[PDB]
Design a protein. Structure first.
Length: 233
């Protein structure tokens, strides 16, 4: 039943999943519900699809990929976003600092809630949506990959002139799914300081200027821009 897919209806309609894929997602969600009876899993179950409630698919301007959720209780259902009760972790402090140095109307806030981005059409999507407490990458694998890859392809297939910010080796591995004739892809090193630089090669996060370039791209295709400085507590 569509109730237990946890996705907002405008997304269910936009994704147009088959019966097979809806049953496979329901089994995955039911598997996770049973995992919670032995282990703490972030984020909460009713936040797994939190991104799909903050804006509709037609509102998406920029797609930012995460890895897995934070694993210390600060994950909110949005990639990189922080519960106002927890400290801003190294990744987001590094994002704010690139913004502080490049975008005029940005001032670094004292919090890390990025709900204001999500409403404006910034899709903050973890590539794997659950994580066990205190064990990063514990749910990396084929459990979530088919599902988050399906979302990215649906955004590339059905939308036009969006911006994909790919930071790090795992997000950059999703490059083939994006039609770069319809969409802008911008790649960089992961924002967490001293992250890998390739091995096989990508530019540095510091000075990548991805947020201005995203808006330059949307402006040139006559779409509304993202105001990164708008971050409400």
């Amino acid at each position: 039943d569509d109730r237990d897919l946890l996705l907002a209806p405008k997304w269910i309609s936009f994704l147009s999943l088959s019966s097979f894929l809806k049953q496979k997602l329901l089994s995955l969600l039911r598997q996770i519900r049973e995992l919670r009876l032995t282990t703490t899993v972030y984020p909460p179950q009713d936040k797994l699809m939190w991104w799909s409630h903050c804006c509709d698919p037609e509102d998406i301007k920029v797609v930012i990929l995460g890895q897995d959720p934070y694993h210390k209780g600060q994950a909110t259902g949005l990639a990189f976003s922080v519960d106002p009760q927890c400290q801003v972790p190294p990744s987001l402090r590094s994002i704010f600092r690139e913004l502080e140095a490049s975008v005029p109307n940005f001032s670094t806030p004292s919090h890390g809630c990025l709900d204001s981005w999500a409403r404006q059409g910034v899709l903050l999507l973890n590539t794997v949506l659950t994580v066990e407490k205190g064990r990063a990458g514990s749910h990396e694998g084929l459990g979530w990959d088919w599902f988050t890859s399906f979302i990215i392809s649906s955004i590339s297939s059905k939308l036009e002139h969006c911006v994909f910010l790919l930071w790090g080796r795992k997000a950059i591995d999703r490059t083939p799914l994006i039609n770069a004739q319809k969409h802008l892809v911008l790649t960089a090193q992961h924002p967490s300081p001293l992250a890998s630089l390739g091995g096989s090669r990508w530019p540095r996060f510091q000075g990548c200027n991805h947020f201005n370039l995203a808006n330059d791209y949307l402006t040139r295709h006559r779409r509304e821009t993202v105001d990164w400085g708008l971050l409400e507590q």
